[model samples]
Target: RPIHIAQLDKARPVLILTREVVRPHLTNVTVAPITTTVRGLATEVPVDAVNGLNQPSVVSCDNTQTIPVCDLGRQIGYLLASQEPALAEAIGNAFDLDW
Candidate 1:
């Protein structure tokens, strides 16, 4: 999702974690929310700087943080095109998923 000021308050950009299950039946995606705050308990996936975001966005994959299954329409923006490659790779490794 592209960053937007409105979603900044309630919604977080997330890395979808589940694989294969949605292939033919399930319609939702499971996600680990990304945050601006870094913590002692979560695996942090760093995002390259982007405007308006102001700081690096970090995705927390550890279950200490809640991940959600959501509809694609719920996403307000896509990660910046240039940044997605690295961010996607980081998230894949963090969740031990094949990218």
Candidate 2:
């Protein structure tokens, strides 16, 4: 779903990439931005209508962000439990870690 942030691209789609670790105070949530532009890159995790989006969009692990918890739109897409590992690996690859 498109979000309403305080600045530019106020209505952009972003996929939450991490758990909502308890923090009632002012904090941010880690997320991976989604764009319909596919560039045949490993860091791009393919997501489609199954995830509540109308068309295909890739999770850009290469450019993640932390948005304030209160600054998010209503939750729309939901990733399947089975797809979690693939995203985890793709995000890990984005970091180019030795693991």
Q: Please provide TM-scores, in order, for all candidate models, with all chains considered together.
A: 0.46, 0.81
TM-score of 2: 0.81
Candidate 1 C-alpha lDDT tens digits along 2-85: 432222236556554545355335554455566778774425656545423457766665632323233333434445567556
Q: Please provide, for model 2 over 1-99, each residue's C-alpha lDDT reduced to its tens digit, 9 standing for 90 to 100.
A: 222222215666777755645434447777788788999899888888887677888878898887777667766767777777788788789998765
lDDT against true structure, model 2: 0.71
Specify the highest-TM-score model's number.
Answer: 2
lDDT of 1: 0.51
> Candidate 2: worst 10 consecutive residues by lDDT?
1-10
- RMSD of every candidate to native, in Å, equals 5.7, 3.3
Model 1: weakest 10-residue lDDT segment is 64-73
